[model samples]
Target: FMVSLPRMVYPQPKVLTPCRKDVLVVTPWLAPIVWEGTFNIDILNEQFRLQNTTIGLTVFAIKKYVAFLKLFLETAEKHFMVGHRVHYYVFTDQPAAVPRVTLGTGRQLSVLEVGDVSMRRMEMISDFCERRFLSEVDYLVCVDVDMEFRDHVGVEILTPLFGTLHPSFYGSSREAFTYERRPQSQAYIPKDEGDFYYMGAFFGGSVQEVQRLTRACHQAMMVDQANGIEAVWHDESHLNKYLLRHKPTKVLSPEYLWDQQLLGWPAVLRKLRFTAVP
Candidate 1:
């Protein structure tokens, strides 16, 4: 595709100085660990905008979670991929309860009905990717419906595939992480092996990559069920196991997802982009 980007002036980069001296910026695999100050949104926004990239965001709002959609959707309109083309997929059992909210020009929301599946979210996403997201969007972001965006979370976090650090376990030792420990379970991970603990609440990538991950997890979940073994943390246990085998292209710092009240404001986080209200 032949295209021209207009001349834009921004601050010159200092090659010697690291973007964030206080935290880890790049993973061992060389994937960027996205945090505030590590990116110039002016450049990223323009690059994505010029390409006419469309991002699809999916959230599960089943049962009680349907109540959280109004604030989540409202705040997201303010902070989540503001200038980009955004397609919000709200999955819920009760579609009639969804509240009406104003949306920006390029942003749209669609609510789909789904019965309670408990741990079948991966299956749900993979099935949908096959049915819709594959043809509809450039990237797919799967996140919890209970949170709201408090700051910018835009194209900078986009990658072929990624997993956001669990807000509570980011600083904890791998041994202490709440991973599936039993060797009998398909989601089991030996104590000696693991990387960062990824939150099931937020993880996604290109439609193809996202489909692969979810399908794999869904298959593993079924295998575990057949063996009469349940993972300690449901989908999250399987997610951590999968990421350990397949590294992500980008890793979102806890900065992208946090609990404002529970964790409070830690100095390590320069900005809290998305957060849980409670």
Candidate 2:
């Protein structure tokens, strides 16, 4: 139920050497994906403080979202339990509204400013994770601003990608993902192709490996411009192209990053929920 880029390839890290201990680093652009009076707010905020999970949200500078950003921090503090710490990294073009979010267990919002990078923002993200923050953490999750952490998606998603032979990361479905700029934009669609698309979201094993992939993707962006190939979604298209050429470790499920697609074949009317594949 997510849209994605076409699959392509770049480089693979054969010696990433898996590590058991890891932290989740999420890079988010400051955009609106939530509003007041939404039940999703409570559910999402609580999930972040789940055991063994620490969140680092990257926020770009946007004055309009200052209130939303503040509310975001407060929501994290209110819902995320006291035991676990949630860190918010504000990567902005301007100074943060307030000093920081004073919250739970060593929880604090740190602000970083990078000169206006509306263009090639993807590369900026790649460079930051690879060069600046890779050594500080074990994992890097490049997430979109619009997404909310609704489920306890910690080890389940992270562990799978660690051992995957695929050069790229995992994603959602494909059919729902649009490409070719327009519906009849002339893409290589086959009759027998299954419906699968990748959301421009991923969990990288290590900072170095993830950064390397990001850099390569940034490199591909240049190729897109040179060839005069302007896809509907820029980074998403480039990401998919990388995936097409490279075999990504695949895990299919709607919960990881579900969208507003309303079609269902429930487990049973008797059973409203399902357990994890433990």
Candidate 3:
């Protein structure tokens, strides 16, 4: 006999109206823009947990950046994808300096040693796709280490491929986006051709989708380097190019990633799930 699942009781979220009705909540490609009210976390959490999902979080923390890990990890313990299986892969130049912040049950960390070449991060992530991530987790969340979880960041944001709107350019037009404009570079994107300006600081997807994204970006960066024509924003430029051609399955709003101290909490944002450390 099958066991019945317990019914969860939570307040219903207002989903009819966009949190910021002035802005687009879903992309033209039909991908969700993860605003606060756009998702019901209780529902999402139950769905993912029932599937026995395991999420892998990857971050880069080199030199003084290691100082941010204590707060980042601790706050994550409080708010990030709680009750789900999570493995944090911290890539740093100095593994010995990594903090031993205790994690909750079903969570673990692996400090991997890497060189100080920031540009190679894309390549490294792609390299680990099959060897580490594929065998380890169901999804991968690639983010910068200089941020902290301020509110609930549960499974509501997971997708096959996803990107987050840059806090600085969410309202800006395509012409204002800082995409690689040089014709000689592989990351070039004309002003007329673009969807959204995605922040390279935070992006993720299912293991396979994340792998494909990282590999494409790494290859594009290599082509630019070989031609002696680096894109304006380096990896960020290539990232925009990749997403434009191969649209993300989901687009997280600034709510998923923001700098509350720099931008402050606006009325449009019901909750700030993650933010840059001030």
Candidate 4:
């Protein structure tokens, strides 16, 4: 009976448990950077190979739009699967007091704070993507927070054209692409040559390409600032100007970006043969 009193050993609790790898992330936020935009990601997870990529939604400190913003955040989480996560970056002047949400499946969710930059709404986008955490993204997409995607919009886009081009970097607009040389206003369309028209929203590319172009855009914006001149379209004009001579930027069609207005029969016929995968 005395020999039966041996002490029992309990295994130490693991401080760090092994976790599944990170995949696609949907980030939505106010201008200061909060990532609640991906509300339905969990629902889409079964079909998507969600890695650590984050979806970023930028706002300009509008508290009223909080409910609308949450729609996206919840959509990202619901549409995305178990392995997916939402990274919201809210850029507000004050600390957001919204209660933290605990998503199941071990997906992390949070808000990031940052100061406002004095510039066009478009420039705010380029500023956000230049961060270090976004470096691991194989692909980076800068989308407008107002638009909602019905399908896996990420999959339909993001591939470079001809194996060496990055079309997603520039906003794809069917409008006439041109460059001017006004020399008075910052958007001096050379009146001679230019690239295709890019819209205010829907720009993307590989992480490296985006990092380079975004940083380049920031630099270009600063240069214009020092000159006491600014383009009418701000970042949109600057992006088009940059792509005018830059090589390997394909012009994506309306289907890829989807026109806000439905076109007439004649125009609709023309859009039927669109392809971003040429």
Worst 10 residues of 3 by lDDT: 1-10
Question: What would the per-residue lDDT of candidate 4 be over residues 1-278, giving only the tens digit for each residue?
Answer: 11222343444435374211121121121111101232233323323343444443333334444444444445545443224433444444444643444565645544545451445344444555456436434554554444443334333333331011122422333343443344765456664454445554555556556656656666777778888876676776666665554432333333334423443223322222111211
lDDT string for model 2 (161-252, tens) is: 22221112223244544533332322323333423345554333345555665676677666556665555666665555554444344432
Ranking the candidates on lDDT from highest down gives 1, 3, 4, 2
Relative to the true structure, candidate 4 reaches a TM of 0.55
Full-model lDDT, candidate 4: 0.43
Give Cα distance to truth, residue 11, candidate 1, Å: 1.3
Candidate 2 to truth, TM: 0.56
- Candidate 3: regions farther than 4 A off: 1-22
Error of 3 at 227 (Å): 0.4
lDDT, each prediction: 0.90, 0.42, 0.87, 0.43
At residue 17, candidate 4 shows an lDDT of: 43
Q: Which runs in model 4 stand beyond 4 Å of their true positions?
A: 1-67, 77-90, 94-108, 116-131, 134-136, 160-181, 184-187, 248-251, 256-278
Please write out the lDDT profile of model 3 over residues 1-278, one tens digit for every residue. 32344698877656684456665778888998887666667678767887889999999898899999999999999998899999999988889889999999999999988851636779888875467899999999999899999898888889999999999888799999999999999999998999989999989999999889999898888888789888898888888999999999999888888897789988778888889988
Among these predictions, the greatest TM-score belongs to 1
Which pairs clash (backbone N, Cα, C closer than 3 Å) in model 1? none
Q: Which candidate is the best by lDDT?
A: 1
- Distance from true location, Cα of 267 in model 3, Å: 1.5
* lDDT score, candidate 3, position 14: 63
**TM-scores across all candidates?**
0.97, 0.56, 0.93, 0.55
